[PDB]
Amino acid sequence: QSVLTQPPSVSGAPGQRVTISCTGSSSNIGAGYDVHWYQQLPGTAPKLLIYGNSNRPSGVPDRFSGSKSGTSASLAITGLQAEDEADYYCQSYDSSLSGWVFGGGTKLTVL
Amino acid sequence: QVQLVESGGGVVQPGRSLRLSCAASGFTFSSIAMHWVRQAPGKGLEWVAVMSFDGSIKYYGDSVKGRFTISRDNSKSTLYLQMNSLRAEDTAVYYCARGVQGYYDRSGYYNLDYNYGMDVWGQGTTVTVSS
Amino acid sequence: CPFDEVFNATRFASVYAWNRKRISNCVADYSVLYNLAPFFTFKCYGVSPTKLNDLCFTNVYADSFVIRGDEVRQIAPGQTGNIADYNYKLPDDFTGCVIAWNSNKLDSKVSGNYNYLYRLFRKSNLKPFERDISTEIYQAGNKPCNGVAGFNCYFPLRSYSFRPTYGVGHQPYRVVVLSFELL
Ligand SMILES: *[C@@H]1O[C@H](CO)[C@@H](O[C@@H]2O[C@H](CO)[C@@H](O)[C@H](O)[C@H]2NC(C)=O)[C@H](O)[C@H]1NC(C)=O
């Protein structure tokens, strides 16, 4: 299965603000450990999108934001173009299994 | 520049064991930790293994525990992953992903950095359990 | 001994111009660093504590600045982004220890403490241990700016927008960074 629950497919109209929520139990975010975000096109390997809940590496634009509120985190994109219709995953570290568990994997669309 | 290549794709029968090999190219290989993640086709990612700066500390997920071992070499700039008793579910692509540099805690206890994520990823090869 | 003045400073500085200190031929106790406080964070990369009995005190620099709580874990080796490529960059090298403690009520007021800044728009991202000073326009694309701050070319700094009702990761963490070397 998957440890961290996120919705399987979230739609999107261009120019809007789309949320992707990742709820984890009280053993991965409840211990204070951080939640990251990845970006995986089909046919290739993912790239790092957000680490440390709000940061961004060199290469991604200013539209990729995130936060961490309690036991759940969320990502938001504003002003989306047709370039980014790939999957996103949330990653955290727990002490229930002491493993770097992932999320279920959402799916974004452009209409 | 910085990239990771790997080898060891396979066609695997009921009972077999296998080894994976992921080379490294461009950056300081002897300092940063290394992660292994896999992804069954049809579902998302899944964390497999990690090994520290020197190799003294390793961790394993629940779906891979008891059948998996790991080793690295700073000489040939390689990373290994041998795998025992491959069952009927583990057909997946296997990524070798660069981790983050470990840190020293108070009172002199070396441990992995647990906050961060995996920065740069390779290509991944596909083991295929079958009949 | 001499770095008890770097922890209680009434005003630190922003990350686009921090403040080093050559510490010369004096006693450094180093047991006030570990066993200091529970709520401090003591990541150390270069060498471990309870080992540093060597004759190390050859110009130890203690950097210090202020950043967001979600931005503390950008200061590590590597870890590129907005504040580690244009403001203050660490190498993959002998950076000793990084300490980051919370400034809950030292600066966070409701109208905003404006003297904390960060340079977001810079060409040719930084070398390690490099400080920037100049405040001119970025020249991103086309037509040259003789200095008006008109269009497609931004003011290089940016404000900080303080408020007490922020998250845990946006109230400021006062961060110090040491350094280790020899002769
Ligand atoms: C400077 O700041 C340091 C902390 O970084 C102070 O050390 C602690 O200070 C508190 C009082 O604020 C004491 O209760 C602790 O016992 C001190 N701990 C240690 C390990 O010394 C230091 O006293 C401050 N100095 C001043 C007030 O100038």
Which conformational region is residue B46 in: left (phi greater than 0), alpha (psi within -120 to 50 degrees), or beta? beta
In a domain, A68, yes or no: yes
What is the distance in angstroms between the Cα of C68 and the nearest Cα belonging to chain A?
A: 10
In a domain, A74, yes or no: yes
In a domain, A3, yes or no: no
Number of domains in chain B: 1
In a domain, A78, yes or no: yes
Amino acid in the structure at residue C97? C
Torsion angle of alpha carbons B31, B32, B33, B39, nearest 10°? -150
> How many whole angstroms separate alpha carbon B38 and alpha carbon B64?
11
- Chains B, C: CB contacts within 8 A come to 42
Instruction: Give backbone dihedrals phi and psi of C43, rounded to 5 degrees, phi first.
Output: -65, 135
Experimental method: cryo-EM
What is the distance in angstroms between the Cα of A12 and the nearest Cα belonging to chain B?
A: 21
Which of C96, C62, C87 has the alpha carbon at shortest distance from C175? Answer: C62
In a domain, A95, yes or no: yes
Distance C49 CA to ligand 1 centre (A): 20
In a domain, A86, yes or no: yes
Residue nearest to atom 24 of ligand 1 (CA): C8
Residue nearest to atom 21 of ligand 1 (CA): C32
DSSP string spanning chain A?
--SBB--S-B---TTSEEEEEEE--TTTTTTT---EEEEE-TTS--EEEESTTT---BTB-TTEEEEEETTEEEEEEES--TT--SEEEEE---SSS-S---B----B---
**Cα angle vertex A54, ends A100, C106, to 5°?**
115
For residue A28, count CB atoms less than 10 angstroms from its CB and return exposed for 0-12, middle for 13-18, buried for 19 or more.
buried
Instruction: Residue C85: list chain A partners with CB under 8 A.
Output: 58
Residue nearest to atom 20 of ligand 1 (CA): C36
> Which atom of ligand 1 is nearest to C101's Cα?
5
Name subunits touching C (3+ CB pairs < 8 A). A, B
Name subunits touching A (3+ CB pairs < 8 A). B, C
Is the shortest distance between the CB of C157 and ligand 1 below 6 Å?
Answer: no
Contact by Cβ (8 Å): A90, A37: yes
Q: Which residues of A86-108 are buried (b: 16+ CB within 10 A; e: fewer)?
A: bbbbbbbbbeebebbbbbbbbeb
- The domain spanning residue A78 has which CATH number? 2.60.40.10
In a domain, A5, yes or no: no
> How many whole angstroms separate alpha carbon C68 and alpha carbon C162?
11
> How many whole angstroms separate alpha carbon C50 and alpha carbon B110?
12
Distance C96 CA to ligand 1 centre (A): 22
- β-bridge partners, C108: none
B121 vs A45, A99, A103: nearest CB: A45
Tell me if chain B has a CB within 8 Å of the CB of C51: yes
- The domain spanning residue B109 has which CATH number? 2.60.40.10
Structural domain of residue A95, as residue ranges?
16-107
Q: Which residues contact A1 (CB under 8 A, 6 or more apart)?
A: none
Amino acid in the structure at residue A21? S
In a domain, A88, yes or no: yes
Resolution of the solved structure (Å): 3.9
Number of domains in chain A: 1
Structural domain of residue B103, as residue ranges?
3-128
